[PDB]
Coordinates of C-alpha atoms and ligand atoms in Angstrom, one line a residue:
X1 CA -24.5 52.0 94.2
X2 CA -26.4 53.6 91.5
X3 CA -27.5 53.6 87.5
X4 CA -25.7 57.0 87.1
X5 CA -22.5 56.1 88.9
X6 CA -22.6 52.5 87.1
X7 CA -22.8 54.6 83.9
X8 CA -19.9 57.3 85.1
X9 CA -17.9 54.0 86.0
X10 CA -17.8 51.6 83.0
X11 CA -18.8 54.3 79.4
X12 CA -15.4 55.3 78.8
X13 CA -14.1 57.1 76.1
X14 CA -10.5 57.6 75.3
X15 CA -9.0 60.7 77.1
X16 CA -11.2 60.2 79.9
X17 CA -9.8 59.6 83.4
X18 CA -9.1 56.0 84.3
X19 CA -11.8 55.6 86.9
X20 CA -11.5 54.1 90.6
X21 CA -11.6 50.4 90.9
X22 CA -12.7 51.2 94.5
X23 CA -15.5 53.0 93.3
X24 CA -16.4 50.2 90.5
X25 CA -16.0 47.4 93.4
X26 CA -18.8 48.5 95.6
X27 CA -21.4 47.7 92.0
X28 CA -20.1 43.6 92.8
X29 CA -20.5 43.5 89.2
X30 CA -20.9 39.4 88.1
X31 CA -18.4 39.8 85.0
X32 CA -15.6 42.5 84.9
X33 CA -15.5 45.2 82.4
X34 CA -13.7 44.3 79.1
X35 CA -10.6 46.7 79.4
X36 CA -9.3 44.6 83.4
X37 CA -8.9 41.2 81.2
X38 CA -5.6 40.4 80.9
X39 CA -4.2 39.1 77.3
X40 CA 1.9 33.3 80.9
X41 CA 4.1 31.7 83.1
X42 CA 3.0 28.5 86.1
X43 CA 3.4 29.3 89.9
X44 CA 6.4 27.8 91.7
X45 CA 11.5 28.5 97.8
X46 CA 10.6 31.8 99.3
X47 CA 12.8 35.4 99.4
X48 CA 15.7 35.8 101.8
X49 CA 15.3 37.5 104.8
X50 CA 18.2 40.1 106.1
X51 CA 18.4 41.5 109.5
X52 CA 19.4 45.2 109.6
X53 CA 21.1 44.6 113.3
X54 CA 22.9 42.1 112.5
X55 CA 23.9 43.7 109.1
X56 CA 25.1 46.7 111.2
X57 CA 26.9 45.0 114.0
X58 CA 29.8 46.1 115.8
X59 CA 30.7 42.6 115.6
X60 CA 32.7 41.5 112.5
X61 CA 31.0 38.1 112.3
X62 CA 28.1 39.0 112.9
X63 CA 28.2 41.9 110.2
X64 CA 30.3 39.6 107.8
X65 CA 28.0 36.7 107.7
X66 CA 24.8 39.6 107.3
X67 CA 26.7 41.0 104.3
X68 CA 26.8 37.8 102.9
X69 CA 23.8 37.4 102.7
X70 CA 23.1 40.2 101.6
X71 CA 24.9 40.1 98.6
X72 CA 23.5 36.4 97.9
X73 CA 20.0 38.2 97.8
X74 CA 20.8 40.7 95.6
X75 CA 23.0 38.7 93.2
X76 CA 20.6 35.1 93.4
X77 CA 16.7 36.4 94.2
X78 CA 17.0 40.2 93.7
X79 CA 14.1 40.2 96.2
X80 CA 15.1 39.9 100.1
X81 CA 12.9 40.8 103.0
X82 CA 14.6 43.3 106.0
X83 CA 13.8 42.4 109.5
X84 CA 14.9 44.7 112.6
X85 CA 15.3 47.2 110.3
X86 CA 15.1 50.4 113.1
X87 CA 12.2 51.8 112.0
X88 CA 9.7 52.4 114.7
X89 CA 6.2 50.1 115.0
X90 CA 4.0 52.9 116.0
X91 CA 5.4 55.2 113.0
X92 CA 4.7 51.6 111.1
X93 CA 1.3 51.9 112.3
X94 CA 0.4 55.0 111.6
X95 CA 1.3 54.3 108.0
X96 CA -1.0 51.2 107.8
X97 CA -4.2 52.9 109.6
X98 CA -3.6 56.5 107.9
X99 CA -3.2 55.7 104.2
X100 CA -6.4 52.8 105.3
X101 CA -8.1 55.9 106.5
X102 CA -7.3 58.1 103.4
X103 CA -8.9 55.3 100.9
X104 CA -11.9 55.2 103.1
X105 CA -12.2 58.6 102.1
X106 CA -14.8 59.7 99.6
X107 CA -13.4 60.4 95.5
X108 CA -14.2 64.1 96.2
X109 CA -12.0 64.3 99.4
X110 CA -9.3 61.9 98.0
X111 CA -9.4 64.2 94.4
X112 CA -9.1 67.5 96.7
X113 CA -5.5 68.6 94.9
X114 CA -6.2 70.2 91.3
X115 CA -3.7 69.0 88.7
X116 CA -2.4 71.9 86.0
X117 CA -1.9 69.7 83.0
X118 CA 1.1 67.5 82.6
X119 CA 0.9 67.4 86.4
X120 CA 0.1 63.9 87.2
X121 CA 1.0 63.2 90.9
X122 CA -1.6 62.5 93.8
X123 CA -4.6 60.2 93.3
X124 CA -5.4 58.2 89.7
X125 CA -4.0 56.2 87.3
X126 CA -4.3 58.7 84.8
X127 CA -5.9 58.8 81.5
X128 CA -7.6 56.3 78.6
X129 CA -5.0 55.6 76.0
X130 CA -7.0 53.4 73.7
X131 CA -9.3 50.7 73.5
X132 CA -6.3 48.1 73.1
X133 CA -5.1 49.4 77.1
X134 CA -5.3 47.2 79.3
X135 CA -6.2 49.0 82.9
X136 CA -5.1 47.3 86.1
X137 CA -7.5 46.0 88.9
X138 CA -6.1 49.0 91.1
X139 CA -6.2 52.5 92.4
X140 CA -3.2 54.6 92.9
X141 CA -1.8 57.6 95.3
X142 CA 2.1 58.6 93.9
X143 CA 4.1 61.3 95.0
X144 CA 7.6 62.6 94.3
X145 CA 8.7 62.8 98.1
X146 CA 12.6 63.5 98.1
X147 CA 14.1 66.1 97.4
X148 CA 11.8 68.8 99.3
X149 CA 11.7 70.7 95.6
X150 CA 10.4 68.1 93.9
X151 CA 7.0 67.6 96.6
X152 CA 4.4 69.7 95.0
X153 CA 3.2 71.8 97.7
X154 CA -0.9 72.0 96.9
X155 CA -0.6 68.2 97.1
X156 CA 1.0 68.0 100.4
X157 CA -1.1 70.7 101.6
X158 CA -4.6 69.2 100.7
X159 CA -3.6 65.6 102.1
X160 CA -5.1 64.6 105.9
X161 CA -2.9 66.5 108.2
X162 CA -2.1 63.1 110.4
X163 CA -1.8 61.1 106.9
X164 CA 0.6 64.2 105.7
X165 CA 2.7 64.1 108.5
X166 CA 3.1 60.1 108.9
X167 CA 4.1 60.2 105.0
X168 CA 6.9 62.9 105.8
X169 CA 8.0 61.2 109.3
X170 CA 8.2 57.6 107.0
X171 CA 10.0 59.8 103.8
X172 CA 13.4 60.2 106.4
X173 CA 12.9 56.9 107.8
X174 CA 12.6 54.9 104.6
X175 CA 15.6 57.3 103.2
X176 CA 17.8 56.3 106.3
X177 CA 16.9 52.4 105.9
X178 CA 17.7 53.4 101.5
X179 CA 21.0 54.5 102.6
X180 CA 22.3 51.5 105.1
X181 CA 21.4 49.3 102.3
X182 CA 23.1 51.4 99.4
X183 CA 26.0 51.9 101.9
X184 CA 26.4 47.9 102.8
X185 CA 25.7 46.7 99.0
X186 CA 29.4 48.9 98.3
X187 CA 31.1 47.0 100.6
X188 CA 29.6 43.8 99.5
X189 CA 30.3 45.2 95.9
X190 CA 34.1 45.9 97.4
X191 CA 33.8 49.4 96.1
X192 CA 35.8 52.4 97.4
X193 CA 33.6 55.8 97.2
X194 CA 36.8 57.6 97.8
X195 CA 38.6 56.4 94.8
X196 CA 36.1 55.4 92.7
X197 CA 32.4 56.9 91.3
X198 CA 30.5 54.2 93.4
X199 CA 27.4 53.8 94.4
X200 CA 25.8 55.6 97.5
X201 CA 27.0 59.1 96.4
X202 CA 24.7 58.4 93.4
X203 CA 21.5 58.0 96.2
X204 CA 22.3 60.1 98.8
X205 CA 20.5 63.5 97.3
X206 CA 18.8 61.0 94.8
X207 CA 15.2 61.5 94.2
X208 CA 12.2 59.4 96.2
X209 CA 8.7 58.9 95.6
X210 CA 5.6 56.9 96.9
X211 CA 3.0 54.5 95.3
X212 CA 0.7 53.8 97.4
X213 CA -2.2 50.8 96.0
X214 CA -5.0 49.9 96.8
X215 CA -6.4 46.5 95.7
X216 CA -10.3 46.0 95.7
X217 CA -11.5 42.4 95.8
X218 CA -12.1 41.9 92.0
X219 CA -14.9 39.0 91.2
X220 CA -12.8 37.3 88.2
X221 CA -9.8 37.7 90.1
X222 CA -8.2 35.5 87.1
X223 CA -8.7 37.7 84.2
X224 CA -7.8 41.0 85.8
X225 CA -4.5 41.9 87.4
X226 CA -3.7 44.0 90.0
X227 CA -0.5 46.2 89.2
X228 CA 0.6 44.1 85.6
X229 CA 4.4 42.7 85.8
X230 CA 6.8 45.2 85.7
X231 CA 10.5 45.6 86.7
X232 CA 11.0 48.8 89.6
X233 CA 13.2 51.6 86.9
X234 CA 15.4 52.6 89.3
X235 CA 17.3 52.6 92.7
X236 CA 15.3 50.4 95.8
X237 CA 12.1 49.7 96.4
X238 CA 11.2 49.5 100.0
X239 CA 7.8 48.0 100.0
X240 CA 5.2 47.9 103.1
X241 CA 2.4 45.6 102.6
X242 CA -0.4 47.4 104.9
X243 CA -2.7 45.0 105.4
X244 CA -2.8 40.8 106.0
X245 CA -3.9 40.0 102.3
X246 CA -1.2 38.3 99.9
X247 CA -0.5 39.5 96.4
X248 CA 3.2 40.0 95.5
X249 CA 4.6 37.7 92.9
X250 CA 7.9 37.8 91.5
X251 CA 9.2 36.0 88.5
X252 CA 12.1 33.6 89.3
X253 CA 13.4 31.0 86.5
X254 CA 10.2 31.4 84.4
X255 CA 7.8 30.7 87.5
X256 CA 5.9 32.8 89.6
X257 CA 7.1 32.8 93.3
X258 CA 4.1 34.2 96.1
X259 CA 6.1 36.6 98.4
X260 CA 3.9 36.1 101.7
X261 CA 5.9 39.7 104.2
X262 CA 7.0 38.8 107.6
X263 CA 5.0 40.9 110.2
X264 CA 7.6 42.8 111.3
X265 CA 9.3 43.4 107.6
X266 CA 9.6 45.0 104.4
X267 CA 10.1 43.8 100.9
X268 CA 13.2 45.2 99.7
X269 CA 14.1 44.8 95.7
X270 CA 16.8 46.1 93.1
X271 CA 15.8 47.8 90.4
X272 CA 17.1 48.2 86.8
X273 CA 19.0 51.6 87.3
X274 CA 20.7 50.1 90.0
X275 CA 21.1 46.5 87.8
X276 CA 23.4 49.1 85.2
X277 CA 25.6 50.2 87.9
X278 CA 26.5 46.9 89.3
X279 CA 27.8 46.0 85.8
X280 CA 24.4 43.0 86.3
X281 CA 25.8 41.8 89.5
X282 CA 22.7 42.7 90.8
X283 CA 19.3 42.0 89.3
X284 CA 16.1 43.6 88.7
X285 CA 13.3 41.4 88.8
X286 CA 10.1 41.2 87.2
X287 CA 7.2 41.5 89.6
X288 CA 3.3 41.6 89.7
X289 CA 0.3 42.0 92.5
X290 CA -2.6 39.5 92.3
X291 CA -6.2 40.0 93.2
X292 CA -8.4 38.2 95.0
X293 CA -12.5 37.7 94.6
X294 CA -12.8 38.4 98.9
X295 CA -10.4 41.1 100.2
X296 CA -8.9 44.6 99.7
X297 CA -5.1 44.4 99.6
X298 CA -3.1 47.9 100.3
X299 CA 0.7 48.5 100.0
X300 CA 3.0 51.3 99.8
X301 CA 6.2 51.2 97.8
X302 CA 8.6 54.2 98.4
X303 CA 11.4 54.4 95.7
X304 CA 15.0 55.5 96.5
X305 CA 16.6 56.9 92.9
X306 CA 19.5 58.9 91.6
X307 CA 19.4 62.8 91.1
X308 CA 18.3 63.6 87.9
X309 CA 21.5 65.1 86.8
X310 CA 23.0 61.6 88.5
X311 CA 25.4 59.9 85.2
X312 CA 24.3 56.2 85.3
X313 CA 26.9 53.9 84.2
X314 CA 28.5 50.5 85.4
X315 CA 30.9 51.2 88.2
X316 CA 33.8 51.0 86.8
X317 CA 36.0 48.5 90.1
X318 CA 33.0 45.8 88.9
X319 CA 34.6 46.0 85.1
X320 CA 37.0 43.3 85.2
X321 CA 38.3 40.9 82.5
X322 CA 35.9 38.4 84.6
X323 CA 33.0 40.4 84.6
X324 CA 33.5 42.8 81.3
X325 CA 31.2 45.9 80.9
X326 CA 27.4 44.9 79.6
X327 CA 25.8 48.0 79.8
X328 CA 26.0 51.5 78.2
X329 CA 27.5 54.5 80.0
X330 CA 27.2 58.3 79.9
X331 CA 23.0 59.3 80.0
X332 CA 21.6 61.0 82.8
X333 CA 19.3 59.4 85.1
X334 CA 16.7 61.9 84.5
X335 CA 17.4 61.5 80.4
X336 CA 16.7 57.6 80.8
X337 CA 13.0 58.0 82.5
X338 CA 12.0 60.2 79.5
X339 CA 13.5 57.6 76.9
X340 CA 12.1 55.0 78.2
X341 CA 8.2 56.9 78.5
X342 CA 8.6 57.5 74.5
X343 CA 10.4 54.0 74.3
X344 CA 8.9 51.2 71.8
X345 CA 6.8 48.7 74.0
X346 CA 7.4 46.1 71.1
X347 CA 10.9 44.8 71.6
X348 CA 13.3 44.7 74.3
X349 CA 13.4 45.7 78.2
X350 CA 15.3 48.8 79.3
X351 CA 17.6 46.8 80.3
X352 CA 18.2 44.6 77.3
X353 CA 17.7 47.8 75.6
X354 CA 21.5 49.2 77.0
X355 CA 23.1 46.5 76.8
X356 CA 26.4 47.0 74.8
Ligands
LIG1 O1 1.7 46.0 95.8 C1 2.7 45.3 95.7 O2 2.9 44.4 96.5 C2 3.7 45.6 94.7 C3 3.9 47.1 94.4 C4 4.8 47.4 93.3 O3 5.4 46.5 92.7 C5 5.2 48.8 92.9 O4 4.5 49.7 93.4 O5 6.1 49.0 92.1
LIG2 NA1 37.5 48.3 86.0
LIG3 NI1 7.2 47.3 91.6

């Protein structure tokens, strides 16, 4: 690939777009450019696995013993995997070969939607900060996908009609899944969404969005990281891996853990939004996705959040003299993304940060 697109590639101002690591992947560069180096904790027990028919049995035992476990995942690993989950394998399918097919695409197709500034959803990781920004071994398609408002209509319009219509297909199916989950973590919880301001009403016309990454082989696969550590900010993650290649890591008791998807599964995970309102019964953990020097990894994470006008708070049945209130009350969910953005980076987590 040539002297010009080497040159396009790697001279990079500050301000400029981030540029693809697809792209910079097909130059099989020896040494990786300075801003992918990384500048840690050893490798390690693997996640629990739910079943979403057993979970919604008509058999109390079988149900019981489901919801069991699945509040042992969410309290113990924060990290579970959900098998016979009801979602269809040839919608499944179509999701793995059509967002495959939409990297395969050239920069120009996959670049097609024009962004009015402060506009940053579709392809890219957006722009150079500095030169102390580290930029991750990764390119990037994310979408705001629920409610219909908040889908930005150029974007949807300009994307691969069968790749478009997959996405919204998988949108109502990942919501549904969101929702069985939500609904069974309030009875595991033991809260009452009649009396109380639980849980699922939060989620129900909550927002949801899409990342999906793509992970070129990198040739100093430790230096560079894929998509750096990071807790999810909100609700559930629902997480397809698309193709065979490993990657997912999660941080458990100051180790690394490899998270190697069941065939047949997703990767299912709390995140810190959803932490706050289980008063820390639940956890949000700290994740990361690897490279490798000799295959392409994809995956698509869809997020399942509140409204923006959604008031995040502990629920106030899981405030107890046992388990007293660690977390702030009273912002909306909508204020806490934009505190966070303009947040100091030195210091504490979001979480640690509302801690009372
Ligand atoms: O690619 C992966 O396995 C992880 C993706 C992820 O953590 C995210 O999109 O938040
Ligand atoms: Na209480
Ligand atoms: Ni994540």
């Amino acid at each position: 690939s040539n002297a010009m697109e080497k040159a396009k590639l790697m001279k990079l101002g500050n301000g400029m777009e981030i540029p693809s690591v697809q792209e910079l992947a097909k130059l099989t560069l020896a040494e990786i450019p300075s801003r992918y180096v990384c500048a840690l904790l050893p490798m390690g027990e693997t996640i629990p696995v739910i079943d979403i028919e057993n979970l919604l049995s008509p058999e109390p035992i079988i149900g019981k013993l489901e919801l069991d476990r699945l509040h042992f995942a969410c309290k113990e690993w924060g990290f579970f995997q959900v098998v016979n989950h009801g979602v269809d394998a040839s919608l499944v399918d179509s999701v793995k070969s059509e967002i495959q097919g939409f990297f395969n695409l050239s920069m120009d197709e996959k670049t097609k939607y024009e962004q009015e500034d402060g506009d940053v959803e579709g392809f890219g990781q957006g722009f150079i900060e500095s030169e102390d920004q580290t930029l991750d071994w990764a390119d990037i398609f994310m979408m705001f996908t629920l409610p219909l408002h908040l889908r930005k209509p150029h974007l949807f319009s300009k994307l691969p009609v069968p790749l478009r219509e997959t996405i919204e297909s998988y949108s109502s199916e990942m919501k549904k899944l969101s929702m069985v989950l939500f609904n069974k973590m309030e009875k595991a919880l033991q809260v009452q969404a009649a009396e109380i301001k639980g849980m699922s009403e939060v989620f129900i016309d909550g927002t949801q969005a899409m990342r999906m990454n793509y992970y070129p082989p990198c040739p100093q696969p430790n230096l560079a990281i894929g998509l750096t550590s990071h807790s999810d900010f909100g609700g559930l993650t629902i997480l397809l891996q698309i193709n065979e290649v490993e990657g997912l890591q999660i941080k458990r008791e100051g180790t690394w853990i490899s998270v190697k998807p069941l065939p047949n599964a997703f990767v299912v995970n709390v995140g810190d939004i959803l932490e706050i309102m289980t008063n820390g019964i639940y956890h949000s953990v700290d994740h990361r996705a690897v490279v490798n020097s000799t295959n392409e990894r994809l995956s698509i994470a869809t997020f399942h959040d509140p409204s923006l006008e959604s008031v995040i708070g502990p629920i106030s049945s899981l405030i107890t003299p046992e388990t007293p209130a660690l977390f702030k009350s009273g912002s909306t969910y909508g204020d806490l993304v934009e505190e966070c953005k303009t947040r100091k980076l030195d210091g504490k987590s979001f979480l640690d940060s509302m801690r009372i």
